[PDB]
Each structure stands twice: as C-alpha cells, then as structure tokens.
Design a protein around this ligand. Structure first.
Ligand SMILES: [Mn+2]
Ligand SMILES: [Mn+2]
Ligand SMILES: [Mn+2]
Ligand SMILES: [Mn+2]
Ligand SMILES: [Mn+2]
Ligand SMILES: [Mn+2]
Ligand SMILES: [Mn+2]
Ligand SMILES: [Mn+2]
Lengths: 417, 409, 410, 411
C-alpha cells in the first residue's frame, strides 16, 4: 500500500520540476477534473441487456441491480466525476416491450441510479441482435416494413434521451450506430446511402430541446460478417452531421490500418458542432480491446488538449473484453485515458506552439521526447489520492475483494427482480 | 498486325454473348465515348515546365516538343479527351514568376487545344519554388509567403476563366498544396484555419461557372512532409461541400487498403462534383502509371454502376520517367477506358434487382463470370472504330515515334 | 445456353491472336489440367463435422452422404480432376471417439468415396472447437495434460494420413494449423515458441513413408479473440519447415494489410522443399471470403506459373461463406483460381523474361497490360467445354436444379 | 539547470516504489550499461562520405575531423559506452580509390578515432550512389560485369571489417544492404534471388575469424523508385542468415503497415545465431525519421529484455533527418532507445511471467498499464547524471553552445 505522505512528497518534487519548464501541475489537475468519461454499461453484462434473453471471466452481471453495483464499484476506482452510456436494451420494466414500444419511463431505474451515483447519462439506440435486422440492414433496409420499424425505434431513442436529459438536467448525447452493409462486394453503393439519408432525416424530424438531448452519428469501415461495404461510412456521417447540425462520433477502432483518428478533429471543427470521441483499442481489426496508454490514445488525448477541443468533444469508452475481470476492464481503460489527458495537460503548450510557429523543429522534438520521461506519474498519483481512489497497483486489492465478495459467488446466486 | 475482319468477327460473337445476358455492346461503346480523360501534360517533361529552366531518352524540352508528344499519345487513345496544364507550362518570352503570370501566357495552349480538338483543365503550381517555406505556401504562418501564394491562386482562377471563355468548355482548376509537417505537430488547428481563410480569399472574386470551377485535392502524406498534411481529405471534402466547389480524389493519396471507390456515394448526397485522379500507389504516393488492377476496376465500376460519370471529371496523375513517357500516357489511358468498358458491359439493372432481393449467390457467380466474358473483343472494336491500333499493335507506333522523334532529341 | 459452335469459333480466333504473340493456347490448357485444387470439405457443413454433433443459406449438409453428394455436385461443375481436404472431425464411425482416440479405419468412408469420385485426399488435424483448447492453446499450452492430449492427436493425424496415402496411392499433405496465441499483449514471446518447437518435433518423430504423407505447417498473423500474439507465426513455420524438411502452408488471408503472399515463393524455394498454397479472400481481416479473380489471386497464380513452382506447390481452397449456396461457393472459388492460372499460362513468358533481363520495362508494362484484355475468356470457355462443364453463366442452371432436387428439400 | 541532489533524492524515492513491487533499480541501471548502441556516422554529413566528394539545418560536417567532432559531441550527451557504424564511403585516404579498390588502412583514421573515443566500430558496405548501380541492381544484377564489381566490394568490406576488428579487439558487425529490385511488377522473381544467393556465397567464401567480424544481412519491403519488388526480401535474408550461420538485420522502418518487428525475435532465436536491430521510425513509409519513444520502440526494447535476447542482439541507430540539428538527432534517438530499454528493465518480469503462465491476464493488463506511469524518469535521470550527461531539458544548453562555438561557424 502506497503511503499518502509519500504521494504528497513526490507531487511537490514533480510540481517543482514542471514549474521550472513553465507548467503548473495544480492547474493541470483542475483541467483533468473537467473531463468526464462516458463509461459504457454493456461491458458489464456482455451487451445482453434486459429486454430480450466459454472461457469468459466469472461474475457477469445478469440484472439491473447487479450491473448498477458493478458500475458503482468501477466508478469508485475511477477518480473524478463521470457519465454512463446506456443502450436501449437496458430498459428496466416488467411491461412487455419491443424496441418500437419502449417508453421514457422504462429508464426511470437508470435516472434514479444516476442521480444517487452523481453521473450524467448518454444513450444509444439498439439497432442489432433482433429478428427485424434483415440481411444486416435496419434503418437503410430496402424493405419498407423493416425500415419503418427501425425509424420507430430511432424516434423513440430521441424521446427517451429528451426525457432523461430533462430529469437529470444534463444534455444526453443520443448516439446512432447501425450495422447496415454487405458481407460481399455490392453493385449499388448509392441507393443504400440515399435510403439512410431519408430515414435519418425522418428520425430527427420532430424538434426536441437541445438542452435535453442532441444526436451523434457513428460510422464504421467494416464489421464481422459485413466486411465489404458499410452504408453509414465515416464520410457519410461527417457530411450528415455538418449538414444537419448534429454531432459526429469517432470510434478509434473503426478506421483503416495506420489511420490516426486524432487528425480528424482540426479538419471537422472549422465546419461542425461537436464530436463524440469513442476510445477503443483495435488489434488488427475492430476487436474492441480495453483502452491502454498507447500511441493512438496519447495522440487522441494530446490533440484534444493542445488544440482546445475538450469543451466541444464528449469522450466515451467503447470496448468489450469478457476474458478478464469486467469491472477491472472499465478501470484500466478510464485510468489509461485520464493519465494520457493529464500528460498532454502537463506540457508547456503555449511555448511549444511558439517554437513550432518559428519552425524550431529541433527544440520541438527534444522537448516533446524529454516530457515523456518527466514525472507525470507523481501528478497522476496525486490526482488519484485527492479524489479518494487507490494509487498505482493498490486498486487490485479492491478488485480481489470484489471478486471474493461478489463476482466469484454471483453465478450460484439466484437472479431476481 | 491484327486483321480488322478478325476484330469484327470477335466483336459479333461477343455482341451475341452479351445480348444473351441482356447487355447491349453497341450502347456500352456509346457510353464510353462520353468519358473524356484529362491527360496531364507534366508526364511529358518530368514536371520541368518552361517558367524556371537513368531516365528514358527523348524527354520533351520545349512547348512544341511537349505539344507533339501529347498529340502522339492522344492519336493512340481512342475517342475525344482533354489535357491538364500546370501554371509552370506558361508559354511567353516575358520574365514571369507565379505571382505575375497573365492569362495570355496560355494562348499557346488555347490555340493547340483548338487545333487538337480537346478541352483544357488547369493546376496552380504550389511546389518547387523558393517561396515554399518549411513545406508551406497558402497556409504558411508567414504573411509574406501566404500573400505570394494567394496571388498565385487568384491568378490560377483568372487564367482558368480566360481559357474557359476562349474554348467554350469549363476549365476545372485543381488546387494541390504540399502544406504540412515532416514531424509531429503541436498545433493541428491553426494551420487548417489559416488554410480556410486563404482559400476563401483565393475564391472571393466571382468568375462565371460556365468558364471555370475550382477543385481541391487532399493528401494523407508526402516525402519530407510525412507526419501532418494541412489540406486533409476531410478538410477538403468539408471545404468543397460548404463552398459549393469540386472535391479531388487522387487514388494514390489515401491509407493502405483504403478503397477510394467507397467515397463517391457518401459525397454526392451532399456535394456538387468530383475530380477523380487515377494514379497507382505502390506502398506510398509513388505515382506509378495506372494499370488494370483492383483499385482502377473498383473506381471505374463504382462510377458506372451508380451513374456518377456526368458529375465526375476523370484525370490521369502519375509520373514514370523510367519508360517511354508517351507510352506511359497510353498505358494509363487504355487501362482506365477498358476498365470503364468492362463495368459498362454488365447487366447492371438486373444485378441491382438481384441485390435488392438479397440474392448474393447470383451476384457473386455473375460478377465473377463477367471478369472472363469477352470484354477484350468490345475494347478492340472500340479501338478500331476510333482509328487506333489494336492490342500490342500500338507498340509499332511508339517504336516509330522513338526512331523518328524521341531518340533524335 | 452458350452455343458450343460459338465457343469453338471464339477459341479458334483466340488461338490465332495468342499464336501471333508466340503463345500456344492448346499447350496452356494441357498445363492447366495438370494443376489439381484441394477442395476443402468443411465449406459444405459450416465446419460441423460428424465427431461431435439467421441469414444462413438453406440446404446445409448434415451427414457424410449429404456432404459427399454436395462435393460430387461441385466437382461436376469444376473442369478437370482435383482433390479434397478432410478435417479430423469428418471421421465416419459408429464407435465412441475423441480427437486422441481416432483410428485410420474411421476414414474408410472417405477413401472409398475418393476412389469412386476419382480424386486424391489431403488432411488436417482438428486443433479447435474442443474443451481441451485451454486459453486458446493446444500443442504449445503451458499445461502438460493439454500438450500431451494434442500431441496424441498430432501423431494420430500422421497415422491416418499414412493409411489414406497407402490406400489411395497418392501422397496425403497433412496440414497443421493451431489457434495457439494470446488475445492481449504477452510478457514472454520466447517460451511459447520453444514449447511449440519441442511439441512439433515430438509429433513428427516416428518415421512414415513420404510416398504416403508429408506434413505442412500453417502460420497466422492474428485471429478473432487471439489478436495480439500467434505462437505459430509465418517466420516460425518457414524456419521450422526448412529446418525439419517439411512443407510450409501459405494462407492468402493470414498476412498483414497490403502483404503480397506471391512474394514469398521465390524467397522460400532456394532453401525449402514444398508449399501448400491456401487461396482465401481476406476482407480487412481473416474473413475467409470465397476466392475471386482479384490482384491477390492473379499475383499468386502468375507468380507460381512464371517461376515454374507448380510441381512443388499444392494449391488448396480455404474459405467459409454460409450466406450463399455452399456448393456454388466451391465452384466460384475453384473456377476463379483456374481462370487466373490459365491467364498466367497464356503470356509469352520466355520473351517477357528476356525483355526484363534487357531492362526493357516499357515493353513489359505495355504487354502485361494488353494481355489483361486478350481473349483469355475464349480459352477458359474452351477448357470448360472440353472437360464437360457448363460455360459462363450456364452452371447457374445446375445450381438451381440441385437446389430444387436436393438442397431445398433438406 | 537540474540540481544533482534533487535527482539523487528522486532516485531514492523511485528505488523504494520499485523495491515494493520486487524491482531492483540499481540492477536495472547496471543492465542498461551493458547495451551499447551503434551510432550511424552518416546522419552527421547527409551520407555524403569522403570517397567521392559530391531547406536543411546549418552546420553539416564536410570533413573527417568535423564528423569525428560531431560524433564526439553526440556521444558526450549519451550516457554510458557505445559504438559507431561506418559506411565504406567514409574511407579517409589521399590515394585514388573506387569501391572495388578500397584497402583496410584507408580506415586507420577511424580505428585511431575509435581508440581515442573508447568505442567499437561496426561497418556497412556501400552498394548505392555509384555509376555501377545498373537499373537499381548491384550484387544480383543480370550483368556479370556489374555483379563482379560489387562482389569485389563485398569481399573488401569483410577484409576492412576483419582488419578493424583485429586493431580494436572488438568484433565488427559487417552489415550488407542492397537496393536491388524493380520499380514496377517483375515477370521473374526466382532468378534475381538465385543470382543474389550465388553472389552472397562468393562474397563470404574466403574464411575470416568470427572474433574480428561477422556479416549481417538487411532486407527491405520497398524503397523510393524500387517499390514493386526487392530482391533481398526479409524472408530471403532470415533464411540466408540461418542457412549460412550469419546475423539477420531487422530495420524497424522496412516492414509492412502495422507490422510489429518485435514479434520476429522469438521466431528467429529457436533457429538462428544473432540479430542486428536497426531502430528507425517509419512515418507511413521508410522515411528514416529520428527514433522516438513510441509503441514500436517500446515493443522492440521490452521484447528484447523480457525474453533475454540482448546478448545476441546488436542495437544500431538508422535514420537521417537534416531538417533539425544533426547532432541533436543522434542524442534524441539514443536517449529514446535507452529510456525504453530501462523502462522494460524496471518491470517485475519474473512475477509477470508467472501470472501470465497461470493465465492471470487481468493482473497482467492492470500491472503493465500501471508500470507506464511508475517513476521510470527518476531512474533515467539518475543513469544520465551517474554517467556525466545532462538531465532532461538540460542537454539543449550543450546543443546551443555547440551551434554557437562549432556548427553555426562552419557554413
Ligand atoms: Mn463506438
Ligand atoms: Mn468497435
Ligand atoms: Mn492528383
Ligand atoms: Mn500522387
Ligand atoms: Mn488455410
Ligand atoms: Mn483464414
Ligand atoms: Mn537499417
Ligand atoms: Mn530505412
């Protein structure tokens, strides 16, 4: 167990080290406080939800109460104040429901939980794992009956999101992700994107207060069993968001091999409103690995900090690893993102910008490289301790306690509710 | 030497093979006639131009030589096409810099285009100049550098307007900027805001759309500018749509495994027009001669199947000096044409119906069979009908041009 | 229906166009009929096998007799004579078996079928979809019980292979693919590959007649749920094959983005014995799409043909698409491969090589590009007709008849 | 300026943090001392060399003395004991020489400098920038006159390397890199590689003691103007090295998009003798950017120390950036590599290995991620200070002084 006075001592030394290069470590920690991460609920129960009925880790959540407890446990090890992303299938009601019959009140459970937990809520319509998914197509299906069903869900997703936003007093980002596409090479690339354009326009048609909710649109290059064509491409959705004055969702695992998603922000913000940045680790495909401190995460976080885009960018976690402790998964990803944000915030950005404007690329290379071995860990440790979360390896103690007390017994416990 | 009667025989057999699956070979050839390729002048003289004075012999060194080489290439490319000029191909006895060019400096090319019977497209030259400061031009943080290149940009529009008025054919004025960083930048925002402001100033003075319209060409990375490109594909698609201008897709300028044929159907619900630069990247932006490969096949069939040709200008953009430079044009142009023609020789309306009905079996079988249908016999007929040599035969014309012209330089 | 006179006509015109550039179309077709393709049995029944009993196309095979009939139908529409790959889980027996208790006689069904069908057989041990797959590891597992189990199966794959080869009088290529790897970033990359080296050496220890069987070893870059580290890498297996004088398996789906597997042949053969070339279409991952005529297949086929490597290269199909008629999948993939081989064989290779030796890169570019629009289709159509298979679209009639009479009735 | 007592106090605190997770910082720094980096001479003078006399940062070296002084300055800012790589075109002689008439004594200047400086030397034959490069081919050219010329150079590279090895009493790694290939798609892939095999075998024919020199073979996926085919492929050279019992050169910039060269070590060492690891940063192609602390470098260094391959792996620098202070370029790349090696050496590797063997992938993910924010910087700073080099930003002062006193006065 780290000693709190050692953390405080190491922080004063680091603060001095940074002050000597014109960086204020107190101000950097204050900046990190103001960046809430939207923790995805579906990592807790392998995206089962509650609407419809292998070497994976024990302790999967099977009920609202279980998932809520698991997210509370994860959030108690993530320093600061954050948000939670819900999916439509996480509706809590005993009334018989389908995706086109959900009502705002079906999320009262999550509204009450979020108020008592002190987090905001983001929302995702569920356009997958349903018999109305016809040949991998939903909203942009050539079948009018299939299209009309999913348009109904899409409209309902806004109604729910508006209601949640009104009750919490915090704007709900309503994210749209559609599987729509083909496994093999299509003949017609145009007509599916025109069907999508018209169906999306119909979904966002009825006005709702922007203070309560706003829609984001999430593209993808390719998915399993849908590899050759994605109806909702990144180009289609950036165009759609700018044109219809909505948010654009950038998921870090959904782009080309070698594609740096941190390049997109400064090409979008001269034209568009806001982004939903979904941090996710792709390993040679859209594998949805837990977020770690790697090149991609470091570039995403430093690009948002350096160019001042945080107040127009929502940061969400989107990954799914059931092979490890599901609660640990959230905490690794959240801490990875926070410490990368913090490292970016501990740079003398104004002086570096100056040197770069004067084409002093020598200084820029040297300093950026020296900063990677500066004592950013001491500032991170201080941030963890100040927000009553365990430091470094110490949070494994919390995970072992949660495994003994909950996760390793859960499977044998009778589910109820 | 292929016998015309053999071409005619093969064509009649192919015509019947295609008619049996509801494809009209005569109509397919009429469709191909309507697609002019914009042949880039700079392949002729390794992008030297005329403004600022182990490769294959016979490089063009003068306007007349370059004009003669383009005439030779066009004579071996069936149908009617266009030529792309760079600003540095100005023809004048006057002392010019990129900020002092005048429209009449291109009278030479207007006259040549009229006698050759081709339209002209234009490119501002924002590279190979002392005023390129740290690989930046219009979006340079130095106002002296920015103002110089803004003057050149404005002049590129005035030149393009003048050419368009004289030819009575709209000149597409393509903007490509090297602007970016070799290594990792701190500020990605400000360069792109400087670009936005500069481009807006360049296009400020209204010019008739009947004479010219601007297109904007993004890049992922170039040599010595690998880490950041100010003018990104996203920046320019957004810029084109918002400013009601054309977007330039160069097949060589995207990510590994990136399929540029995906972009058309995501652009046209929002945008006005495309300039599609066919170019072959070999593991980087290598500007290899266009060949019949997956990329070209997908580009051409995507434009044909979704009926985007009337809104897509097709230009060649490559540079290979290791081979006969005139041959380079003909290989690239013929690859593009035969690929367009193969796409036009599909029963597209029936295939679309099969696809709407989720008959993915029929789609796979038929698209694979069409790859070995006799599309070559329709291509050969198109070549012959338009007074150009068939197959290997045009190598005779190259060897004669080498002997009589190129090898004598 | 295509008119056979039409085909014969178009062929004679093609024959002359090719003759004019020093290519013999009759000779090219003779070369093609000497290239057997190893048709994978598992496309027919979604790799279910027989050992351990939503937008999926109808008519899936459920029994040996059904799978046998489906492969007979597919082969009937593929011109020339070919081979079939079995997996261990395709054992046909009424006896209680696990992967470590399989007997050669359990493959008597397939030997009898192959002799009647007139095809050779290749083999694959089944190192997946089993409770003894522990944390995605089999032969190279750190758990000795798991190792021993999979080592027993490895040895049995060789024994079965030897028996099939003896009975058929044609060499059985016994292909080893293992899923062994880690989902996330490993600490120790060395020890797993040392465990694999030791285990493989144990599996191939007991000598078996080469005339009957030889082993091939199949690497992978990454798989679903095993993305970060593959124990059996391409580098590992090329080194293992060369050093233990075995075959190396190259699957066209299992390499890096932009990786051209046709580059590997000429870098292997100065050192190595033979290759098992598995044609498979990756679409942005190891997606096992049906093989089509694309840059990869064209480069694979022309690289084998131009450099004379066919006599040392076994060509197998490896793909799994259940979204389309499963019998059609076989025929599309096989015809695409043969088409692409034939186009390679229809080039003036000796003259092009001389042009290249003299650095005449102009002639090489012009000619290779012109050959892409030469009437190779007319020669392919002739090959199809000569070997009593339908021409072009026509074989769709056979699929519709097989759907009505057999597939749609299951 | 950093205060030595402040570095020492921060080190003692870090020592304690690492001791508590079973890591010995003092031992970790001793392990780092034993990894010499082979600093490439050609970054100093834009690969001009001296043999054939004939936008960019000022102060390029133009003479042996200027280059020697620049490498001395760079080494003075890189903590510990390292090596220098020479190219054959860095011959120092007033005699009229071609690449096929170089003599060992032509390198006496560099032997004398290395003895003075207290560093070992590695060597590279120069198979580029010469009229005898015919259609981008050298050793494996279809022209027997071209082949024979370059084979003469290849034999001479071994004779030079043996001589240097003897004089310095330190084995010279003689690295072979050939541009040989095609710009566009070849018809015949087989024959070029059979020509290469035959030519390499003739080059290494004459026996020389391993004690003085051993050959390494460097492959490439593609180069500028040689994009479509490389005769000397990675597969060809790994097979060649294992077969002929020589070293295999892995250059981090010469592989496919997304390729992780750190994967290759554990697939090589069950079969082969040794590696020459050229650290180099590719940015979307073989761009030869200065090495920085990124995923690739972190994976290369941790893969070598985790699996205990350092005693069989020579680490060399290979990059060329003339847009920045050329001496600075060396220090950035060397320090990136050392701090990355050091971080990997500061992990509880035995415990992590045990956890992994026991399939505790939860613990492995948590711990590896926590280690990335442990105070490795305080250990790095201690290593820098202990070895009489400036800490953190401080060495920018030395660069500015060297610009003022030496570099900016040259041009
Ligand atoms: Mn997402
Ligand atoms: Mn994902
Ligand atoms: Mn272009
Ligand atoms: Mn280009
Ligand atoms: Mn395979
Ligand atoms: Mn596969
Ligand atoms: Mn190197
Ligand atoms: Mn390099």
């Amino acid at each position: 167990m780290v000693k709190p006075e050692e953390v405080d001592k190491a922080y004063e030394v680091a603060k001095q080290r940074y002050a000597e290069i014109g960086v204020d470590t107190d101000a950097a920690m204050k900046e990190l406080e103001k960046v809430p991460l939207s923790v995805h609920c579906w990592q807790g129960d392998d995206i089962h939800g509650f609407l419809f009925p292998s070497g994976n880790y024990p302790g999967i959540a099977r009920t609202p109460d279980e998932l809520a407890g698991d997210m509370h446990e994860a959030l108690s090890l993530i320093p600061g104040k954050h948000r939670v992303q819900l999916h439509a299938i996480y509706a809590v009601t005993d009334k018989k429901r389908d995706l086109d019959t959900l009502e705002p009140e079906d999320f009262d459970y999550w509204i009450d939980w979020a108020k008592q937990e002190g987090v905001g809520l983001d929302f995702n319509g569920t356009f997958f794992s349903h018999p109305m998914v016809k040949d991998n197509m939903t909203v942009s299906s050539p079948d009018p009956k299939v299209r009309d069903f999913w348009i109904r869900h899409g409209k309902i997703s806004r109604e729910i999101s508006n209601y949640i936003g009104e009750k919490l007093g915090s704007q709900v980002v309503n994210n749209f992700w559609l599987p729509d596409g083909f496994k093999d090479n299509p003949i017609d690339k145009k007509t599916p994107r025109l069907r999508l354009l018209k169906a999306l326009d119909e979904i966002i048609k009825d006005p709702l207060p922007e203070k309560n909710t706003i829609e984001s649109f999430e593209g993808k290059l390719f998915g399993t069993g849908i590899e050759s064509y994605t109806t909702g491409s990144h180009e289609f959705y950036q165009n759609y968001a700018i044109s219809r004055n909505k948010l654009w969702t950038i998921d870090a695992g959904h782009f080309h091999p070698t594609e740096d998603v941190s390049d997109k922000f400064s090409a979008f913000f001269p034209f568009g409103k806001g982004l939903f940045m979904h941090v996710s680790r792709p390993v040679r495909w859209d594998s949805d690995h837990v977020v770690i401190m790697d090149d991609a995460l470091i570039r995403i976080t430093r690009s948002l900090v350096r160019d001042g885009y945080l107040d127009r960018t929502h940061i969400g976690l989107d990954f799914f690893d059931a092979t490890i402790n599901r609660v640990a998964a959230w905490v690794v990803g959240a801490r990875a993102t926070q410490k990368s944000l913090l490292q970016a915030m501990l740079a003398p950005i104004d002086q570096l910008k100056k040197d770069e404007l004067n084409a002093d690329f020598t200084t820029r290379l040297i300093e950026t490289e020296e900063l990677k071995s500066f004592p950013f860990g001491a500032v991170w440790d201080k941030f963890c301790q100040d927000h009553n979360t365990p430091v470094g390896f110490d949070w494994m103690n919390n995970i072992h306690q949660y495994e003994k007390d909950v996760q390793f017994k859960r499977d044998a416990k009778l589910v109820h509710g």
